[PDB]
Amino acid sequence: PTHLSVDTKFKTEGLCVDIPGIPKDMTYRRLISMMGFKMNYQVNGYPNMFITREEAIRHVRAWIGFDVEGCHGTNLPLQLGFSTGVNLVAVPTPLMYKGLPWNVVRIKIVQMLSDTLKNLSDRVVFVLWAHGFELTSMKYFVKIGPERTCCLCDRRATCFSTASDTYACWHHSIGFDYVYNPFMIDVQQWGFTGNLQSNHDLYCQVHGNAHVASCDAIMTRCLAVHECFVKRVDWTIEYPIIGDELKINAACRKVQHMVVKAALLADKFPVLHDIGNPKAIKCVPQADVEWKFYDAQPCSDKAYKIEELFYSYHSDKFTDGVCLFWNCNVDRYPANSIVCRFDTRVLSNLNLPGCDGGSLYVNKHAFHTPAFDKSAFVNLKQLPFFYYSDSPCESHGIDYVPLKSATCITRCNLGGAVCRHHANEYRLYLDAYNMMISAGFSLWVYKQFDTYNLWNTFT
Ligand SMILES: Cc1nn(Cc2c(C)noc2C)c(=O)s1
Numbered sequence: 165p166t167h168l169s170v171d172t173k174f175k176t177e178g179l180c181v182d183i184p185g186i187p188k189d190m191t192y193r194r195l196i197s198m199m200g201f202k203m204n205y206q207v208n209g210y211p212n213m214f215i216t217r218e219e220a221i222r223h224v225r226a227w228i229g230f231d232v233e234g235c236h237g238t239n240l241p242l243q244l245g246f247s248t249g250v251n252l253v254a255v256p257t258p259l260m261y262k263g264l265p266w267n268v269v270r271i272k273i274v275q276m277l278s279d280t281l282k283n284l285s286d287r288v289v290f291v292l293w294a295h296g297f298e299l300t301s302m303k304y305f306v307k308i309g310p311e312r313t314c315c316l317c318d319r320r321a322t323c324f325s326t327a328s329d330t331y332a333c334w335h336h337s338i339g340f341d342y343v344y345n346p347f348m349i350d351v352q353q354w355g356f357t358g359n360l361q362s363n364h365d366l367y368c369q370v371h372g373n374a375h376v377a378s379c380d381a382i383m384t385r386c387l388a389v390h391e392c393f394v395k396r397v398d399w400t401i402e403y404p405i406i407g408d409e410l411k412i413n414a415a416c417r418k419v420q421h422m423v424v425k426a427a428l429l430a431d432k433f434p435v436l437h438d439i440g441n442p443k444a445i446k447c448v449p450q451a452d453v454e455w456k457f458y459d460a461q462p463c464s465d466k467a468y469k470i471e472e473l474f475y476s477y478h479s480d481k482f483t484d485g486v487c488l489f490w491n492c493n494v495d496r497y498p499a500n501s502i503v504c505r506f507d508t509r510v511l512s513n514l515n516l517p518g519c520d521g522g523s524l525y526v527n528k529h530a531f532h533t534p535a536f537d538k539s540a541f542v543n544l545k546q547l548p549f550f551y552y553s554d555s556p557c558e559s560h561g562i563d564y565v566p567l568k569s570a571t572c573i574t575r576c577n578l579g580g581a582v583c584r585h586h587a588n589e590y591r592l593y594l595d596a597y598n599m600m601i602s603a604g605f606s607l608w609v610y611k612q613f614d615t616y617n618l619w620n621t622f623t
């Protein structure tokens with residue numbers, strides 16, 4: 165039960181229009197052979213070109229939707245579409261390139277996958293809604309063999325160069341022409357009734373069908389994402405570290421502690437309603453406040469309707485005190501709220517494009533987040549940056565430049581000059597805050613929040 169067996173049956177019904185007379189009885193072994201690839205009984209880490217749904221989910225960062233549409237098939241030119249929005253035309257002799265021979269097309273394919281994937285994954289997973297041409301065209305840009313390492317580094321090889329007879333990862337593949345040991349999955353094998361557009365449109369209104377190959381490639385990967393992350397949710401799956409994951413998570417924990425501590429000091433709420441993650445711990449352990457928890461797992465489909473989290477008859481009165489929605493995405497927040505809401509629009513190596521405007525945020529775990537909506541925050545306002553500290557002004561134990569700032573809410577700044585300790589802690593906190601903002605997170609607070617109320621907590 166490790167990899168997908170090559171002797172597993174492959175349903176060929178979706179392939180019989182491009183490939184008439186295709187055998188109904190088909191294995192991955194016979195299919196790979198029909199595609200022009202010789203697996204040669206090789207026990208060298210690449211057991212099958214196709215992968216399981218579980219293997220695909222573990223490698224979601226590698227997904228590239230791929231679709232080939234016949235323009236006019238060895239006689240006709242093909243249109244190669246990718247979920248990157250790229251459309252290449254291969255002559256056999258929404259970016260739309262004119263017809264070019266395969267030897268130049270393959271070079272472009274390696275450039276595009278390398279630039280899209282080098283900071284995401286150690287491989288490519290071509291996500292298909294297989295009809296024939298995409299599988300028969302792979303011999304023109306894909307080479308297979310034993311698992312290899314990069315000529316310039318220790319990462320696995322994902323490319324091959326016929327010109328130099330060498331292999332490279334996605335980072336050292338400049339000038340490489342072949343895709344080496346790609347992975348693939350046919351979404352049609354999961355059992356669907358009807359075509360791609362009818363299944364995709366059941367869950368997504370953001371990707372139209374402009375009737376080009378890349379449009380289908382986009383709808384394919386989107387449908388795959390909905391099936392694997394929207395309706396099916398697995399938070400036990402671990403994902404490798406590819407960037408600032410640890411810093412972003414540390415920063416988010418510092419910002420939450422800071423923002424919640426200050427709201428409780430400024431407005432002295434008697435009760436706080438913590439709506440979100442059922443495993444949450446009090447972010448401000450020493451706060452006076454009555455801390456009440458409400459369990460609500462991350463919503464991956466649509467944002468929670470505030471009515472279904474609060475009503476149908478807990479303090480019951482969420483209107484008493486303040487409500488904390490730390491990454492708990494709701495359709496419209498109540499006015500007495502402290503809110504952290506991930507902005508799905510953010511461009512990043514952690515944030516992958518998702519379904520219905522949403523995004524797949526992959527940081528240790530994969531969280532499909534519903535589309536960001538500015539109207540969720542109409543009863544709230546954007547939370548401004550501030551650093552608050554009631555700790556003593558004491559250095560203990562990095563060269564200094566005097567800190568001058570209106571947002572350093574400390575006793576030293578109240579009394580005129582900011583001390584070295586609060587200046588180091590202010591700069592560190594501003595860094596953590598900037599990290600979290602640029603990671604996509606947005607902070608919102610109740611309209612009456614005013615940091616001016618924090619100065620009298622020093623006397
Ligand atoms: C990461 C990945 N980026 N893309 C391209 C893309 C972008 C950009 N916005 O929507 C899609 C779809 C993939 O297909 S995988």
Ligand SMILES: [Zn+2]
Binds near residue numbers: 336
């Ligand atoms: Zn390399």
Ligand SMILES: [Zn+2]
Binds near residue numbers: 364368369370519520
């Ligand atoms: Zn879609």
Ligand SMILES: [Zn+2]
Binds near residue numbers: 558576583584
């Ligand atoms: Zn100080």
